């Protein structure tokens, strides 16, 4: 077990004890990055996350050796990930599409179970209990629960609530904790929304976002502090800061190999995933129900699936004005062959300036073809193109120009404030 | 009336039943899930006819058999053939086990050694392969030998509608088909231990038999026969049984009224408490004479010729010489026989929840006015203390002859608001 | 504001 | 709300044309859940055969091959 948390910068794993502050897992980082959803799979020791700058959901091992994409198609803003460790279904809320999507890992079946929401932020799934929990922070804010299927969607806490930014489940006692960022409070209740109690006032917590519950403690992430803080799950009490001065601080999640155990009818050893082809979902009173991907309907057997192009006709990777990448991304057509890797797998920059896959206006053309570089790298004093045709034949920028009298002319013919001489 | 989604014509007895139930042709409403499951939950199998099952689908949470019958999901791969066509057990990767706890029962069960060929089938193979693997055996009586397999089931299951002995003796024409019982006796729901004809409709079902007392005889058409003696309207009694003190007549009033046992007499190894009344005792065995605890009304059993000496300060000393524990002083019981443990005592008053009788005996207030003399003197059973005066209703409020107060205007309002045309 | 942007 | 607007269950106002237009204008699905429209017709220029749900390419008319069920 260790405390897993995200950021603008990177996703990090730190020990629960403050005695040692050395990262337990190698940080996950990219140069264009903004990491907002996170969840873990202790069986294969992998961590799922979403990069809101690339709109791609990845999975990466703890030691960082193996990184792959889960999906990169039709994502707008994946606010929160959650993983059903028994049935191996990955759920996520989409703030842009205003919907929540379930994806199976064994085969890439995908289904948009819940739609037509307003501001879905946080999602938590309870495999053994069978419920999924969701928060919407629109004006009539509510916390909703439903079966893992996505049916029976009914409100659970819809009064005295505003901006419920985060949800967490106390696995030890089967209680649902959530944070309110408007009233600046932590509340908890049973899975039925009854016996609602409010924790004691926390000292400086004033814009909480993510929380998680581990042993006797709640770990809250606060945006305004830029910090992760810890309190007792009973009444709050002895607030302790775990890290200080994050860039932007997003979710926390308690990695734990102990809680990712147990089984139900979806993980029986005697037969495959509860005999349901494609998706099987846990249901309360320890039942299971089968599902089928988009474009496919469940048959009379209530377990096998067949194609239904009448209600759910097939769709292409994306609309007309765009190029489909290999990883499933889609990019505007006028960003193909610009020398910039926009697909994040170099699909849009493959085989440019040959067989009439022409370069875009954003590139400069190599003389003999077979490559393009950004127009910003033409005459940039670097030899980017193999034949040197980007730096050959480059005229100077020794123009008829002057520098403002308030300013000093560098010998490189750039102007600076006259006060920056001899500093 | 068109019951069950206007598909079943059922007798219009007015017993309309819930949407959470499936109406049978017999009027019995099982819950709605108990159709098309190849259990005959009506008995008659109306619930299991092709008329319904050819135009039905299972609830999403059930498993569906190859024949289209539904079955609760937990019955999948459970070593039981619940579908009939065994699809619930098809393609299950059952556990391997070793000879110390398995003989390879066809269903894949692992059953302990000495439980194979033990005289009784336990692995529930359809061919009874648990037991018939041993040729030479034939067993003791009562545990009856059902034909060519060595199995031996008590005669409590034979000619009964269950082929549970596996081999056909349990139902087939060596008995059963020509008669249930010889003319001296009559059937039971599972015992071939048939009941003599005068046993049924005597007061108790003499075996499992929902007709013995309910409908095999006229309730009130004729009495107990003069061969035996009436003692309650539900029970007649043979002879000696009226005198022994046993609860045989079923109101227990045998040893009373005026017919029998004002007195008793003791045989060998028994002694009579001569100084006693019917409420206490009048014969005890030698197993209790001069033992550690008083038995008779006056505890004469412990005096006899014994007249022992040893008694210390650890026990209260009586006048007659016998001793008892200190707790048995000043109480409701005659512990010492001599009443020395009670003479001179000063009883503290009863608790709040304790009614007090005129003689000083405390009884629970619950016991008051229950038509039982709980303290002897009848303080708790008297006319005016146990009185509920009828409501006055002095004007308006014209009560009807059934004995409840109703408004004056309701009388001859052409509405039968009282018991039987009282208004 | 509470928008994640 | 104005006569030119619907009243949503939560008290939002949305235009007459926006009622069941296929968008969550009421933000509580009131305008979509209330009146479920039945667009089972060919609004296209494609030529509908008399009495059928079948509608076909306009080029079919006397082109030499029976294209509607009755030709
Ligand atoms: C906010 O949550 C409450 C509680 O879930 C919603 O009120 C209504 O609560 C009842 C349970 O008390 C839900 O079930 C109903 O119960 C009555 C019996 O009391 C029964 O006669 C009904 O048939 C029904 O089963 C009811 O569904 C629930 N209402 C809804 C629409 O969920 C309250 O409505 C919620 N606020 C909003 C914005 O709807
Ligand atoms: C564009 O990119 C594809 C790879 O996705 C590349 O194979 C095409 O090259 C060739 O274009 C020829 C026409 O200019 C065509 O006849 C040929 O089959 C094709 N493929 C190969 C292997 O030579 C690029 N051009 C086009 C127009 O697709
Ligand atoms: C056989 O029985 C022994 C116990 O004597 C047990 O240890 C073993 O696992 C069993 N099975 C096999 C495959 O040997
Ligand atoms: C198993 O039992 C059924 C009846 O209970 C019987 O009809 C069937 O033939 C048996 N299976 C085999 C393979 O003999
Ligand atoms: C097309 O879009 C639909 C939803 O409208 C499904 O997501 C489907 O999976 C998509 N098809 C492809 C090829 O990704
Ligand atoms: C060049 O041709 C290709 C043909 O696939 C693309 O249309 C591309 O956008 C074109 N770019 C320019 C600058 O003409
Ligand atoms: C560089 O190009 C500029 C264009 O404004 C001038 O023509 C200048 O004269 C050139 N530099 C030299 C060294 O002649
Ligand atoms: C010189 O050039 C700068 C811009 O590079 C300013 O326009 C400035 O006003 C110019 N001065 C003269 C005298 O032309
Ligand atoms: C099959 O019957 C069940 C139980 O009543 C449901 O009605 C189900 O919806 C039916 N099947 C389909 C595909 O509609
Ligand atoms: Ca606030
Ligand atoms: Ca590009
Ligand atoms: Ca260059
Ligand atoms: Ca300087
Ligand atoms: Ca049944
Ligand atoms: Ca079974
Ligand atoms: Ca046996
Ligand atoms: Ca039997
Ligand atoms: Ca009887
Ligand atoms: Ca008796
Ligand atoms: Ca005695
Ligand atoms: Ca006493
Ligand atoms: Ca009484
Ligand atoms: Ca009347
Ligand atoms: Ca609308
Ligand atoms: Ca034609």
PDB file of C-alpha atoms in Angstrom, chain A residues 184-410:
ATOM      1  CA  UNK A 184     -16.214  23.563   2.859  1.00  0.00           C
ATOM      2  CA  UNK A 185     -17.204  20.336   4.685  1.00  0.00           C
ATOM      3  CA  UNK A 186     -16.660  16.537   4.635  1.00  0.00           C
ATOM      4  CA  UNK A 187     -19.766  14.306   5.029  1.00  0.00           C
ATOM      5  CA  UNK A 188     -20.269  10.522   5.102  1.00  0.00           C
ATOM      6  CA  UNK A 189     -23.319   8.256   4.873  1.00  0.00           C
ATOM      7  CA  UNK A 190     -24.373   4.626   4.326  1.00  0.00           C
ATOM      8  CA  UNK A 191     -24.562   3.288   0.736  1.00  0.00           C
ATOM      9  CA  UNK A 192     -28.357   4.011   0.825  1.00  0.00           C
ATOM     10  CA  UNK A 193     -27.760   7.743   1.594  1.00  0.00           C
ATOM     11  CA  UNK A 194     -29.321   7.320   5.093  1.00  0.00           C
ATOM     12  CA  UNK A 195     -27.746   8.165   8.502  1.00  0.00           C
ATOM     13  CA  UNK A 196     -25.895  11.148   6.953  1.00  0.00           C
ATOM     14  CA  UNK A 197     -23.271  12.609   9.348  1.00  0.00           C
ATOM     15  CA  UNK A 198     -20.966  15.643   8.998  1.00  0.00           C
ATOM     16  CA  UNK A 199     -17.300  15.485  10.121  1.00  0.00           C
ATOM     17  CA  UNK A 200     -15.735  18.162  12.377  1.00  0.00           C
ATOM     18  CA  UNK A 201     -14.511  21.453  10.831  1.00  0.00           C
ATOM     19  CA  UNK A 202     -11.028  21.063   9.208  1.00  0.00           C
ATOM     20  CA  UNK A 203      -8.714  24.041   9.929  1.00  0.00           C
ATOM     21  CA  UNK A 204      -7.612  25.431   6.518  1.00  0.00           C
ATOM     22  CA  UNK A 205      -9.464  23.104   4.054  1.00  0.00           C
ATOM     23  CA  UNK A 206     -11.391  25.564   1.821  1.00  0.00           C
ATOM     24  CA  UNK A 207     -11.421  24.110  -1.741  1.00  0.00           C
ATOM     25  CA  UNK A 208     -11.241  20.298  -1.429  1.00  0.00           C
ATOM     26  CA  UNK A 209     -11.210  18.264  -4.670  1.00  0.00           C
ATOM     27  CA  UNK A 210     -10.253  14.576  -4.364  1.00  0.00           C
ATOM     28  CA  UNK A 211     -10.374  12.482  -1.184  1.00  0.00           C
ATOM     29  CA  UNK A 212      -9.639   8.839  -0.311  1.00  0.00           C
ATOM     30  CA  UNK A 213     -10.180   6.782   2.891  1.00  0.00           C
ATOM     31  CA  UNK A 214      -7.433   4.446   4.169  1.00  0.00           C
ATOM     32  CA  UNK A 215      -7.394   2.735   7.630  1.00  0.00           C
ATOM     33  CA  UNK A 216      -8.432   5.318  10.331  1.00  0.00           C
ATOM     34  CA  UNK A 217      -7.784   8.335   8.002  1.00  0.00           C
ATOM     35  CA  UNK A 218      -9.236  10.540   5.212  1.00  0.00           C
ATOM     36  CA  UNK A 219      -6.664  12.062   2.812  1.00  0.00           C
ATOM     37  CA  UNK A 220      -8.076  15.260   1.224  1.00  0.00           C
ATOM     38  CA  UNK A 221      -6.569  17.238  -1.659  1.00  0.00           C
ATOM     39  CA  UNK A 222      -7.147  21.021  -1.490  1.00  0.00           C
ATOM     40  CA  UNK A 223      -6.750  23.266  -4.572  1.00  0.00           C
ATOM     41  CA  UNK A 224      -6.212  26.620  -2.755  1.00  0.00           C
ATOM     42  CA  UNK A 225      -3.548  25.209  -0.360  1.00  0.00           C
ATOM     43  CA  UNK A 226      -1.963  23.283  -3.275  1.00  0.00           C
ATOM     44  CA  UNK A 227      -1.507  20.542  -0.672  1.00  0.00           C
ATOM     45  CA  UNK A 228      -2.574  17.034   0.401  1.00  0.00           C
ATOM     46  CA  UNK A 229      -3.820  16.957   4.050  1.00  0.00           C
ATOM     47  CA  UNK A 230      -4.830  14.022   6.316  1.00  0.00           C
ATOM     48  CA  UNK A 231      -7.447  13.765   9.148  1.00  0.00           C
ATOM     49  CA  UNK A 232      -9.115  10.958  11.237  1.00  0.00           C
ATOM     50  CA  UNK A 233     -12.249   9.475   9.543  1.00  0.00           C
ATOM     51  CA  UNK A 234     -14.159   9.910  12.880  1.00  0.00           C
ATOM     52  CA  UNK A 235     -14.357  13.722  13.352  1.00  0.00           C
ATOM     53  CA  UNK A 236     -11.328  15.073  11.417  1.00  0.00           C
ATOM     54  CA  UNK A 237      -9.242  16.266  14.402  1.00  0.00           C
ATOM     55  CA  UNK A 238      -5.413  16.346  14.080  1.00  0.00           C
ATOM     56  CA  UNK A 239      -4.965  17.736  10.557  1.00  0.00           C
ATOM     57  CA  UNK A 240      -1.507  16.919   9.168  1.00  0.00           C
ATOM     58  CA  UNK A 241      -0.110  18.215   5.816  1.00  0.00           C
ATOM     59  CA  UNK A 242       1.445  15.379   3.710  1.00  0.00           C
ATOM     60  CA  UNK A 243       2.953  17.578   0.897  1.00  0.00           C
ATOM     61  CA  UNK A 244       3.244  21.355   0.434  1.00  0.00           C
ATOM     62  CA  UNK A 245       3.381  23.679  -2.614  1.00  0.00           C
ATOM     63  CA  UNK A 246       2.145  21.445  -5.486  1.00  0.00           C
ATOM     64  CA  UNK A 247       1.657  23.188  -8.918  1.00  0.00           C
ATOM     65  CA  UNK A 248      -1.990  21.978  -9.279  1.00  0.00           C
ATOM     66  CA  UNK A 249      -3.056  18.955  -7.220  1.00  0.00           C
ATOM     67  CA  UNK A 250      -6.182  17.087  -8.532  1.00  0.00           C
ATOM     68  CA  UNK A 251      -6.903  13.481  -7.267  1.00  0.00           C
ATOM     69  CA  UNK A 252      -5.527  11.215  -4.512  1.00  0.00           C
ATOM     70  CA  UNK A 253      -6.146   7.431  -4.407  1.00  0.00           C
ATOM     71  CA  UNK A 254      -5.031   4.813  -1.830  1.00  0.00           C
ATOM     72  CA  UNK A 255      -3.123   2.032  -3.666  1.00  0.00           C
ATOM     73  CA  UNK A 256      -3.754  -1.173  -1.653  1.00  0.00           C
ATOM     74  CA  UNK A 257      -3.257  -4.818  -2.741  1.00  0.00           C
ATOM     75  CA  UNK A 258      -5.344  -6.002   0.291  1.00  0.00           C
ATOM     76  CA  UNK A 259      -8.674  -4.344  -0.706  1.00  0.00           C
ATOM     77  CA  UNK A 260      -8.343  -5.558  -4.361  1.00  0.00           C
ATOM     78  CA  UNK A 261      -9.382  -9.114  -3.349  1.00  0.00           C
ATOM     79  CA  UNK A 262     -12.584 -11.197  -3.037  1.00  0.00           C
ATOM     80  CA  UNK A 263     -14.924 -12.484  -5.775  1.00  0.00           C
ATOM     81  CA  UNK A 264     -18.554 -12.740  -6.955  1.00  0.00           C
ATOM     82  CA  UNK A 265     -20.478 -14.445  -9.815  1.00  0.00           C
ATOM     83  CA  UNK A 266     -18.412 -12.334 -12.300  1.00  0.00           C
ATOM     84  CA  UNK A 267     -15.103 -13.967 -11.146  1.00  0.00           C
ATOM     85  CA  UNK A 268     -16.036 -17.626 -10.374  1.00  0.00           C
ATOM     86  CA  UNK A 269     -13.040 -19.978 -10.917  1.00  0.00           C
ATOM     87  CA  UNK A 270     -15.274 -22.762 -12.382  1.00  0.00           C
ATOM     88  CA  UNK A 271     -16.514 -20.736 -15.438  1.00  0.00           C
ATOM     89  CA  UNK A 272     -15.593 -17.656 -17.510  1.00  0.00           C
ATOM     90  CA  UNK A 273     -16.547 -14.156 -16.186  1.00  0.00           C
ATOM     91  CA  UNK A 274     -20.095 -15.286 -15.258  1.00  0.00           C
ATOM     92  CA  UNK A 275     -20.856 -16.854 -18.714  1.00  0.00           C
ATOM     93  CA  UNK A 276     -21.585 -13.351 -20.123  1.00  0.00           C
ATOM     94  CA  UNK A 277     -19.840 -12.523 -23.435  1.00  0.00           C
ATOM     95  CA  UNK A 278     -18.366  -8.962 -23.385  1.00  0.00           C
ATOM     96  CA  UNK A 279     -19.427  -7.035 -20.207  1.00  0.00           C
ATOM     97  CA  UNK A 280     -20.635  -8.676 -16.957  1.00  0.00           C
ATOM     98  CA  UNK A 281     -21.743  -6.338 -14.135  1.00  0.00           C
ATOM     99  CA  UNK A 282     -22.091  -7.068 -10.409  1.00  0.00           C
ATOM    100  CA  UNK A 283     -25.553  -6.300  -8.970  1.00  0.00           C
ATOM    101  CA  UNK A 284     -26.762  -5.903  -5.347  1.00  0.00           C
ATOM    102  CA  UNK A 285     -27.825  -9.050  -3.394  1.00  0.00           C
ATOM    103  CA  UNK A 286     -24.668 -10.638  -4.967  1.00  0.00           C
ATOM    104  CA  UNK A 287     -26.262 -11.010  -8.474  1.00  0.00           C
ATOM    105  CA  UNK A 288     -24.664 -10.446 -11.936  1.00  0.00           C
ATOM    106  CA  UNK A 289     -26.087  -9.082 -15.257  1.00  0.00           C
ATOM    107  CA  UNK A 290     -24.517  -9.192 -18.747  1.00  0.00           C
ATOM    108  CA  UNK A 291     -23.855  -6.222 -21.119  1.00  0.00           C
ATOM    109  CA  UNK A 292     -22.891  -5.745 -24.799  1.00  0.00           C
ATOM    110  CA  UNK A 293     -20.704  -3.148 -26.613  1.00  0.00           C
ATOM    111  CA  UNK A 294     -22.048  -0.209 -28.681  1.00  0.00           C
ATOM    112  CA  UNK A 295     -23.708  -1.538 -31.886  1.00  0.00           C
ATOM    113  CA  UNK A 296     -24.532  -4.939 -30.287  1.00  0.00           C
ATOM    114  CA  UNK A 297     -27.726  -6.169 -28.487  1.00  0.00           C
ATOM    115  CA  UNK A 298     -28.098  -8.924 -25.811  1.00  0.00           C
ATOM    116  CA  UNK A 299     -29.946 -12.051 -27.156  1.00  0.00           C
ATOM    117  CA  UNK A 300     -32.890 -14.108 -25.697  1.00  0.00           C
ATOM    118  CA  UNK A 301     -30.311 -16.240 -23.743  1.00  0.00           C
ATOM    119  CA  UNK A 302     -29.592 -12.968 -21.771  1.00  0.00           C
ATOM    120  CA  UNK A 303     -25.843 -13.895 -22.014  1.00  0.00           C
ATOM    121  CA  UNK A 304     -24.763 -13.888 -25.731  1.00  0.00           C
ATOM    122  CA  UNK A 305     -24.688 -10.733 -27.923  1.00  0.00           C
ATOM    123  CA  UNK A 306     -25.532 -10.096 -31.632  1.00  0.00           C
ATOM    124  CA  UNK A 307     -24.980  -7.027 -33.871  1.00  0.00           C
ATOM    125  CA  UNK A 308     -27.833  -4.460 -34.056  1.00  0.00           C
ATOM    126  CA  UNK A 309     -27.163  -1.910 -36.848  1.00  0.00           C
ATOM    127  CA  UNK A 310     -30.873  -0.803 -36.598  1.00  0.00           C
ATOM    128  CA  UNK A 311     -30.751   0.923 -33.139  1.00  0.00           C
ATOM    129  CA  UNK A 312     -26.928   1.486 -32.913  1.00  0.00           C
ATOM    130  CA  UNK A 313     -25.492   1.767 -36.482  1.00  0.00           C
ATOM    131  CA  UNK A 314     -21.668   1.559 -36.958  1.00  0.00           C
ATOM    132  CA  UNK A 315     -19.580   4.781 -36.832  1.00  0.00           C
ATOM    133  CA  UNK A 316     -16.163   5.758 -38.321  1.00  0.00           C
ATOM    134  CA  UNK A 317     -13.203   6.767 -36.071  1.00  0.00           C
ATOM    135  CA  UNK A 318     -14.190  10.495 -36.463  1.00  0.00           C
ATOM    136  CA  UNK A 319     -15.905  13.146 -38.678  1.00  0.00           C
ATOM    137  CA  UNK A 320     -14.848  14.415 -42.134  1.00  0.00           C
ATOM    138  CA  UNK A 321     -12.551  17.446 -41.415  1.00  0.00           C
ATOM    139  CA  UNK A 322      -9.971  15.283 -39.518  1.00  0.00           C
ATOM    140  CA  UNK A 323      -7.291  12.544 -39.825  1.00  0.00           C
ATOM    141  CA  UNK A 324      -7.625   9.264 -37.788  1.00  0.00           C
ATOM    142  CA  UNK A 325      -4.396   8.319 -35.904  1.00  0.00           C
ATOM    143  CA  UNK A 326      -3.328   4.658 -35.317  1.00  0.00           C
ATOM    144  CA  UNK A 327      -3.779   4.919 -31.469  1.00  0.00           C
ATOM    145  CA  UNK A 328      -7.456   5.998 -32.065  1.00  0.00           C
ATOM    146  CA  UNK A 329      -6.849   9.803 -31.691  1.00  0.00           C
ATOM    147  CA  UNK A 330      -8.382  12.140 -34.283  1.00  0.00           C
ATOM    148  CA  UNK A 331      -6.797  15.510 -35.344  1.00  0.00           C
ATOM    149  CA  UNK A 332      -7.882  18.368 -37.725  1.00  0.00           C
ATOM    150  CA  UNK A 333      -6.735  17.603 -41.337  1.00  0.00           C
ATOM    151  CA  UNK A 334      -4.585  20.812 -41.564  1.00  0.00           C
ATOM    152  CA  UNK A 335      -2.329  19.546 -38.713  1.00  0.00           C
ATOM    153  CA  UNK A 336      -1.213  16.453 -40.734  1.00  0.00           C
ATOM    154  CA  UNK A 337       2.377  16.666 -42.106  1.00  0.00           C
ATOM    155  CA  UNK A 338       3.323  19.884 -40.187  1.00  0.00           C
ATOM    156  CA  UNK A 339       6.432  18.251 -38.611  1.00  0.00           C
ATOM    157  CA  UNK A 340       4.675  18.281 -35.151  1.00  0.00           C
ATOM    158  CA  UNK A 341       3.593  14.948 -33.602  1.00  0.00           C
ATOM    159  CA  UNK A 342      -0.089  15.804 -32.862  1.00  0.00           C
ATOM    160  CA  UNK A 343      -1.358  12.153 -32.716  1.00  0.00           C
ATOM    161  CA  UNK A 344       1.315  11.430 -29.984  1.00  0.00           C
ATOM    162  CA  UNK A 345       2.243   8.263 -31.986  1.00  0.00           C
ATOM    163  CA  UNK A 346       3.702  10.049 -35.114  1.00  0.00           C
ATOM    164  CA  UNK A 347       0.737   8.771 -37.271  1.00  0.00           C
ATOM    165  CA  UNK A 348       0.029  12.301 -38.658  1.00  0.00           C
ATOM    166  CA  UNK A 349       3.782  12.855 -39.473  1.00  0.00           C
ATOM    167  CA  UNK A 350       4.293   9.450 -41.198  1.00  0.00           C
ATOM    168  CA  UNK A 351       5.330   9.505 -44.932  1.00  0.00           C
ATOM    169  CA  UNK A 352       4.990  13.272 -45.637  1.00  0.00           C
ATOM    170  CA  UNK A 353       6.067  14.831 -48.999  1.00  0.00           C
ATOM    171  CA  UNK A 354       5.766  11.510 -51.029  1.00  0.00           C
ATOM    172  CA  UNK A 355       3.030   9.711 -53.146  1.00  0.00           C
ATOM    173  CA  UNK A 356       0.781  12.883 -52.810  1.00  0.00           C
ATOM    174  CA  UNK A 357       0.588  12.849 -48.992  1.00  0.00           C
ATOM    175  CA  UNK A 358       1.536  16.569 -49.229  1.00  0.00           C
ATOM    176  CA  UNK A 359       2.937  18.892 -46.477  1.00  0.00           C
ATOM    177  CA  UNK A 360       0.702  21.414 -44.610  1.00  0.00           C
ATOM    178  CA  UNK A 361       1.171  25.271 -44.660  1.00  0.00           C
ATOM    179  CA  UNK A 362       2.608  24.919 -41.099  1.00  0.00           C
ATOM    180  CA  UNK A 363       5.733  23.061 -42.476  1.00  0.00           C
ATOM    181  CA  UNK A 364       8.775  24.087 -44.556  1.00  0.00           C
ATOM    182  CA  UNK A 365       9.522  21.623 -47.396  1.00  0.00           C
ATOM    183  CA  UNK A 366      12.846  19.757 -47.699  1.00  0.00           C
ATOM    184  CA  UNK A 367      14.241  20.417 -51.272  1.00  0.00           C
ATOM    185  CA  UNK A 368      14.299  16.723 -52.383  1.00  0.00           C
ATOM    186  CA  UNK A 369      11.092  15.821 -50.403  1.00  0.00           C
ATOM    187  CA  UNK A 370      10.553  12.806 -48.074  1.00  0.00           C
ATOM    188  CA  UNK A 371      10.470  15.067 -44.954  1.00  0.00           C
ATOM    189  CA  UNK A 372       8.859  18.210 -43.492  1.00  0.00           C
ATOM    190  CA  UNK A 373       9.853  20.363 -40.436  1.00  0.00           C
ATOM    191  CA  UNK A 374       7.891  23.217 -38.708  1.00  0.00           C
ATOM    192  CA  UNK A 375       8.023  26.581 -40.559  1.00  0.00           C
ATOM    193  CA  UNK A 376       9.427  27.903 -37.209  1.00  0.00           C
ATOM    194  CA  UNK A 377      12.573  25.730 -37.805  1.00  0.00           C
ATOM    195  CA  UNK A 378      13.228  27.173 -41.307  1.00  0.00           C
ATOM    196  CA  UNK A 379      16.491  29.265 -41.192  1.00  0.00           C
ATOM    197  CA  UNK A 380      16.590  28.732 -37.340  1.00  0.00           C
ATOM    198  CA  UNK A 381      20.455  28.260 -37.327  1.00  0.00           C
ATOM    199  CA  UNK A 382      19.824  24.509 -36.686  1.00  0.00           C
ATOM    200  CA  UNK A 383      20.280  21.951 -39.514  1.00  0.00           C
ATOM    201  CA  UNK A 384      16.976  20.022 -39.095  1.00  0.00           C
ATOM    202  CA  UNK A 385      16.387  18.645 -42.627  1.00  0.00           C
ATOM    203  CA  UNK A 386      18.833  15.819 -43.641  1.00  0.00           C
ATOM    204  CA  UNK A 387      20.064  17.636 -46.819  1.00  0.00           C
ATOM    205  CA  UNK A 388      20.406  21.023 -45.009  1.00  0.00           C
ATOM    206  CA  UNK A 389      17.781  22.695 -47.304  1.00  0.00           C
ATOM    207  CA  UNK A 390      16.210  24.472 -44.247  1.00  0.00           C
ATOM    208  CA  UNK A 391      19.473  26.477 -43.563  1.00  0.00           C
ATOM    209  CA  UNK A 392      20.840  26.789 -47.157  1.00  0.00           C
ATOM    210  CA  UNK A 393      19.913  29.976 -49.140  1.00  0.00           C
ATOM    211  CA  UNK A 394      18.596  31.792 -45.956  1.00  0.00           C
ATOM    212  CA  UNK A 395      18.760  35.638 -46.377  1.00  0.00           C
ATOM    213  CA  UNK A 396      19.646  37.795 -43.297  1.00  0.00           C
ATOM    214  CA  UNK A 397      17.200  39.850 -41.163  1.00  0.00           C
ATOM    215  CA  UNK A 398      19.626  42.843 -41.168  1.00  0.00           C
ATOM    216  CA  UNK A 399      16.659  45.146 -42.082  1.00  0.00           C
ATOM    217  CA  UNK A 400      16.449  48.956 -42.286  1.00  0.00           C
ATOM    218  CA  UNK A 401      15.284  49.135 -38.605  1.00  0.00           C
ATOM    219  CA  UNK A 402      16.013  51.052 -35.336  1.00  0.00           C
ATOM    220  CA  UNK A 403      15.597  50.378 -31.579  1.00  0.00           C
ATOM    221  CA  UNK A 404      13.441  52.550 -29.197  1.00  0.00           C
ATOM    222  CA  UNK A 405      15.466  55.306 -27.370  1.00  0.00           C
ATOM    223  CA  UNK A 406      14.213  53.742 -24.041  1.00  0.00           C
ATOM    224  CA  UNK A 407      16.078  50.522 -25.074  1.00  0.00           C
ATOM    225  CA  UNK A 408      19.554  49.012 -25.824  1.00  0.00           C
ATOM    226  CA  UNK A 409      20.343  47.343 -29.200  1.00  0.00           C
ATOM    227  CA  UNK A 410      22.027  43.926 -28.694  1.00  0.00           C
TER     228      UNK A 410
END
